[PDB]
Amino acid sequence: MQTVNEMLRRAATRAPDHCALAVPARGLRLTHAELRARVEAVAARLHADGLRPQQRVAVVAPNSADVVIAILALHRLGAVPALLNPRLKSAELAELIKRGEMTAAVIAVGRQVADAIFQSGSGARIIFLGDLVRDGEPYSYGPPIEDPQREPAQPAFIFYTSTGLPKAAIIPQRAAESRVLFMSTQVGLRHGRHNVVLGLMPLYHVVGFFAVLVAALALDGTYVVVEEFRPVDALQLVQQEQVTSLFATPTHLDALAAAAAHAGSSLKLDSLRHVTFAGATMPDAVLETVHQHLPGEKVNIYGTTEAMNSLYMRQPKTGTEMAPGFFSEVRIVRIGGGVDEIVANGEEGELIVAASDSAFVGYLNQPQATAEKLQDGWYRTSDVAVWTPEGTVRILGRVDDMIISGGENIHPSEIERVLGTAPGVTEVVVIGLADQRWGQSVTACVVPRLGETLSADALDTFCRSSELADFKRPKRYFILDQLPKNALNKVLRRQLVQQVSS
Amino acid sequence: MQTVNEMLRRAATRAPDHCALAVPARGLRLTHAELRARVEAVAARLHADGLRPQQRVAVVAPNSADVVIAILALHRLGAVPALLNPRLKSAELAELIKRGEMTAAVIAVGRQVADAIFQSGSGARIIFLGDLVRDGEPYSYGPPIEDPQREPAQPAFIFYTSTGLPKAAIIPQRAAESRVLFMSTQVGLRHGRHNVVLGLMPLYHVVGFFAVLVAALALDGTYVVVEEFRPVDALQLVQQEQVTSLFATPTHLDALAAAAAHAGSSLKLDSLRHVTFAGATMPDAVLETVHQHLPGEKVNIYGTTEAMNSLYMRQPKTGTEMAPGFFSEVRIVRIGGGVDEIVANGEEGELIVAASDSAFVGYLNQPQATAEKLQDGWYRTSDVAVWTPEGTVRILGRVDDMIISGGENIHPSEIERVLGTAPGVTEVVVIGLADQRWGQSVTACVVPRLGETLSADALDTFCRSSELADFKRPKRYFILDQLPKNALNKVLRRQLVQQVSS
Ligand SMILES: O=C(O)c1ccc(Cl)cc1
Ligand SMILES: O=C(O)c1ccc(Cl)cc1
Ligand SMILES: [Ca+2]
Ligand SMILES: [Ca+2]
């Protein structure tokens, strides 16, 4: 195998004087060799402070060159970085660190987080990011340290998912290589000093780390740091840095397209060859503006924290239709059945994917959730899917979102995509409410565009004119001024049911 | 890891009804699933006959769909195929089989080879290819057999090299994946049913097997069988089969270019996107006609049986200047020195390459040769090279071909490339002959174009007009009617020294 460390180490022998890490706004640029020396220096300092191989270390920080250096240093020493979203509540961050039995936590200042960890009882030693490295410059002490022995199944990195608190997925050493190289076999990246990769995806997301940061460096290219997303600024970096690939959220992509659409603009996006996204939830309209206003090859991917890439589609026409690429083996099985209970073609079931080299080895300290998701060599996505007559996979939605009305499956995502194109609608969530037949009734919760007036009659008229089969059209509308959302701007579906029942 | 078997097995789950193997001339076409069933059937028959996992089996046959099925079947059963060039002398083939302690040999009729094996004393059981499978159709008997456990360092395939008899390089299970995927990271192939790969390279060559056959199937594409090379016919297959990539010898490429150069021709080569070659020995002129007359991206690669791909160059300008790609780590060391004796930049030494996942594990039954080539984690290529001011690798020639004159290194390959452009010259070999100073004198052996008259004076005049430094120009010419060559049309350099000394 080639671990993350080995891939970076080899890259550095091949292109030592080539730019590895750029933070243009900060005027900060490091070659592959300069980056490696800084990683080595931070590793040695961390070791001298008592940190040892296979100890878990939390990382709580937003994207920056300094966190890149810290993460890779932990890995170089042989510690296991547990990368956490810093936008989570402080008490939740502290509970996950406690839960995970971490040795230490590396955190970015604004330390109501450090307070939280202390007062949780965790005993994770706090390490401030600014104490380790500042704008690429490390605080250096301690003897040089051995590059430790890493084993294929051994914990390497921990990444956190979405009922309840996020789960700590353990990524083994052997998973890194295919988690990078799918970007070559599926997305068509290739080795070379031409690679300039824009860092839009968060580092605590598996795509942000493996598919973006590691792939950039491992292919002997440049990773461009973005500390704060702004569409005009991001497109200017494409031109100025000669960016060749970008991976972004559907939401960032809609904003980037709109910014690229001005005829009075001087922006040159010619260098950009690959625009990649996880577009299962992307509406036809968003995808259309992406095709129109951004250059490069568009590639849709399906993936998970647990198993990385499982499906993709070159030059997609809709976001939900994809097929397995290199590394992947997929099935669709009876919802709630064993891994060998293949559905007849055209029937709906749960998408499952083989757990090969790229797969997590379990959820840290959560044996119960692990047994439910990893069964008999297969990862269970908890997504509903169907094989089409063309032999591709159509993603239908989450098992848990599914609505059963008159004994028939209805997927709110489909109905939401339709209703989101209706006049006056700015937001829509489709949910099932209990009927009097022991089933559920398709119900739509809609927010009006500012100043517009919605009506159940007009919305139903729009649905009747759509392609929606009769049984799918909402039986009832709730017109609301806003939807209940958590701090991560995500809709609280349970809270919504309870709200509309009274 | 993903073995050859696993890569093919996964491909077959992904594209069972897509064409895997085509022999257009024969009207023979098999899907991935049809191919897999035939592999399984041949494996089961071979097992029932007594063949077991980890036993070595020689394969002596020219490219054909049937040998593809036999090789993969042996691998499926878990036996170790030892692939042999059928153009070698029968007695030499029998000696290698004996030397290798093979359990059996699968051979293509014209069995002066079977006679040879018997009368060698080998005790390898003879298996005729035509007894196993005929035009894709297997002779089926025996119970279904288990897919055996394969381990990363365990022998998988054996491939033979070039003093003395060819050596049996043992390729481990873990080597297969990077031996395929370099075609993605270096050459820019990607996963997909668009892949149609023309099978010009021999299956008993590592490129022919890993980079061509296995890569074709593993990426869910089609392998087009070519039993006998003919330029017009090969280009017609490009058009008719919509070939996307081809890997050929410099010699085949010169012939394909010439055939493509006709303005009266109806050939459409539009589908062809990748023309790949090992061009270290390719003259500037040949490369020029390749650029002019063949479409697709041209990529030069450097590789070995022992370590697969170590250097490459996109859109090459000369054949000798390349750089390490993904997977690779390279050094240039003091000729005859330890692996850490790095040369100062611009000084000549031996190219060595790290022995990572793709590397052989040794030469079967040849511990002495193994110790010379695999030292301290490094494979020794026995090629001389130098780092250029641009930081690329320039291949200079074989260590053993090097001529020392007045204490200075001269590489005949360089002098041969120059002299091959001289009027009247059809063939040239540059050799060193003993001088009276305990060194060697640069001597050129030249064959005239049919009917042309060569002279030492005219040849020396041409050299004086070239870019050759003074010390490199031949001191002496031998004008010969032909050069001594073995049955593989290769020049016998030792035999040439002895011939011209009398
Ligand atoms: O979580 C995701 O959406 C995700 C994870 C991994 C990949 Cl490759 C793609 C998407
Ligand atoms: O033997 C060769 O020339 C050779 C072997 C392997 C590769 Cl990848 C390229 C060339
Ligand atoms: Ca309100
Ligand atoms: Ca003669």
C-alpha distances in Å from residue A199, one per residue of A108, A204, A238: 19, 12, 11
Which of the 8 DSSP states describes residue B24? G
Q: Distance from the CA of A228 to the center of ligand 1, in angstroms?
A: 21
Taking the mean position of all CA atoms in its chain, how far away is CA A137? 29
Q: Classify A379 as helix, strand or coil.
A: strand
Dist. CA A121–CA B11, nearest whole Å: 51
Q: Can you spell out the DSSP letters for B108-133?
A: -S--HHHHHHHHHT--PEEEEHHHHE
End-to-end Cα spacing for chain A:
57
Closest listed residue to residue A316, CA positions, set A300, A302, A333, A297: A300
Taking contacts as CB-CB distances below 8 angstroms, the residues of chain B near A324 are 14
End-to-end Cα spacing for chain B:
57
Closest listed residue to residue A28, CA positions, set A135, A137, A138, A140: A135
Closest listed residue to residue A76, CA positions, set A38, A28, A33: A38
Both structure tokens of B200: 């010009």
Dist. CA A494–CA A163, nearest whole Å: 10
Partner residues linked to B57 by β-bridges = B81, B104
Dist. CA B228–CA B209, nearest whole Å: 17
Closest-CA residue, ligand 2 atom 6, reads: B303
Dist. CA B269–CA A155, nearest whole Å: 49
CB-defined site of ligand 2, < 6 Å:
B 206-207, 211, 278, 301, 303-305, 308-309
Both structure tokens of B381: 């290529």
Dist. CA A185–CA A325, nearest whole Å: 8
Q: Which helix (H) or strand (E) holds B491?
A: none
Contact state of B190 with A191 under an 8 Å Cβ cutoff: no
Q: Which of A10, A186, A191, A299 is the best mutation test for B, with the most CBs of B within 10 A?
A: A191
Q: Classify B341 as helix, strand or coil.
A: coil
Contact state of B184 with A186 under an 8 Å Cβ cutoff: no
Partner residues linked to A444 by β-bridges = A430, A477
Q: Distance from the CA of A424 to the center of ligand 3, in angstroms?
A: 18
Ligand number nearest CA of B499 is 4
Domains belonging to chain A, first-starting first, are 1-172 (3.40.50.980), 173-319 (3.40.50.980), 320-399 (2.30.38.10), 400-502 (3.30.300.30)
Taking contacts as CB-CB distances below 8 angstroms, the residues of chain B near A323 are 14
Residues A421, A285 contacting (CB under 8 angstroms): yes
Ligand number nearest CA of B322 is 2
**Maximal C-alpha separation, chain A:** 75
Residues A194, A169 contacting (CB under 8 angstroms): no
Residue B435: exposure state from Cβ atoms within 10 A (0-12, 13-18, ≥19): middle
Taking contacts as CB-CB distances below 8 angstroms, the residues of chain A near B356 are 2
In degrees to the nearest 10, what's the CA dihedral of A51, A54, A58, A59? 80
What letters, b where the CB count within 10 A reaches 16 and e where it falls short, cover B172-186? bbbbbbbbbbbbbbb
Relative orientation angle of helices A90-99 and A112-120, to the nearest 10 degrees: 40
Backbone angles phi, psi at B222, to 5 degrees: -125, 135
Partner residues linked to B172 by β-bridges = B155
Mutate-to-test residue for ligand 1 from A308, A313, A353, highest number of ligand atoms within 8 A of CB: A308
Contact state of A186 with B181 under an 8 Å Cβ cutoff: no
Residues B60, B126 contacting (CB under 8 angstroms): no
Contact state of A184 with B186 under an 8 Å Cβ cutoff: no
Dist. CA B43–CA B8, nearest whole Å: 15
Dist. CA A177–CA A371, nearest whole Å: 25
Residue B55 has a CB neighbour count (10 Å cut-off) of 16
> Residue B494 corresponds to which amino acid?
R
Q: Which helix (H) or strand (E) holds A6?
A: helix A4-14
Residue B89 has a CB neighbour count (10 Å cut-off) of 14
Which of the 8 DSSP states describes residue A342? B
Residues B345, B361 contacting (CB under 8 angstroms): no
Could you give the angle at the alpha carbon of B402 between the alpha carbons of B398 and B405, nearest 5°?
A: 170
Q: Can you spell out the DSSP letters for A400-459?
A: GG-EEETTEEE-HHHHHHHHTTSTTEEEEEEEEEE-SSSSEEEEEEEEEPTT----HHHH
- Strands A297-304 and A274-277 come out as parallel
Which residues are placed with Cβ below 5 angstroms of ligand 3, an ion? Answer: A 481
> Residue A137 corresponds to which amino acid?
E
Could you give the angle at the alpha carbon of B422 between the alpha carbons of B421 and B428, nearest 5°?
A: 80
Which of the 8 DSSP states describes residue B175? G
Beta strands in B129-209 (DSSP E): 133-134, 137-138, 155-160, 168-172, 196-199
Going by C-beta distance under 8 Å and a sequence separation of 6 or more, which residues neighbour residue B376?
B338, B339
Sign of the Cα pseudo-torsion (B93, B95, B100, B101, in order): positive
Residue of B nearest to A174 (CA): B1
Q: Can you spell out the DSSP letters for B379-440?
A: EEEEEEEEE-TTSPEEEEEEGGG-EEETTEEE-HHHHHHHHTTSTTEEEEEEEEEE-SSSSE
3-state secondary structure B434-471: ECCCCCEEEEEEEEECCCCCCCHHHHHHHHHCCCCCHH
Dist. CA B83–CA B135, nearest whole Å: 20
Tell me the technique behind this structure: X-ray
C-alpha distances in Å from residue A211, one per residue of A179, A194, A202, A355, A492: 6, 17, 11, 18, 29
Which of the 8 DSSP states describes residue A26? G
Please state the length of chain B: 502
Mutate-to-test residue for ligand 1 from A204, A210, A309, highest number of ligand atoms within 8 A of CB: A309
Residues A180, A206 contacting (CB under 8 angstroms): no
Sign of the Cα pseudo-torsion (A150, A152, A154, A159, in order): positive
Q: Which positions in chain B have a beta carbon within 8 angstroms of at least one beta carbon in chain A? A: 1-2, 10, 13-14, 17, 181, 184-188, 190-192, 218-220, 314, 323-330, 356-357, 391
CB-defined site of ligand 1, < 6 Å:
A 206-207, 211, 278, 301, 303-305, 308-309
Dist. CA A176–CA A327, nearest whole Å: 13
Closest listed residue to residue A207, CA positions, set A73, A299, A318, A106: A299
Q: Can you spell out the DSSP letters for B201-238?
A: S-TTSHIIIIIIIIHHHHTT-EEEE-SS--HHHHHHHH
Dist. CA A151–CA B41, nearest whole Å: 37
Closest listed residue to residue A342, CA positions, set A372, A387, A376, A375: A387
Q: Which helix (H) or strand (E) holds A309?
A: strand A308-314
Beta strands in B24-85 (DSSP E): 28-31, 56-60, 80-84
Closest listed residue to residue A274, CA positions, set A202, A354, A183, A207: A183
Q: Distance from the CA of A309 to the center of ligand 1, in angstroms?
A: 7
Contact state of A2 with B357 under an 8 Å Cβ cutoff: yes
Tokens 């406690």: give the residue: A98
For chains A and B, CB pairs below 8 A equal 70
Both structure tokens of B129: 């290819």
Dist. CA B282–CA B79, nearest whole Å: 37
Going by C-beta distance under 8 Å and a sequence separation of 6 or more, which residues neighbour residue A356?
A178, A327, A329, B2
Relative orientation angle of helices A284-293 and A250-260, to the nearest 10 degrees: 40
Q: Distance from the CA of B489 to the center of ligand 4, in angstroms?
A: 16
Residue B141 has a CB neighbour count (10 Å cut-off) of 10
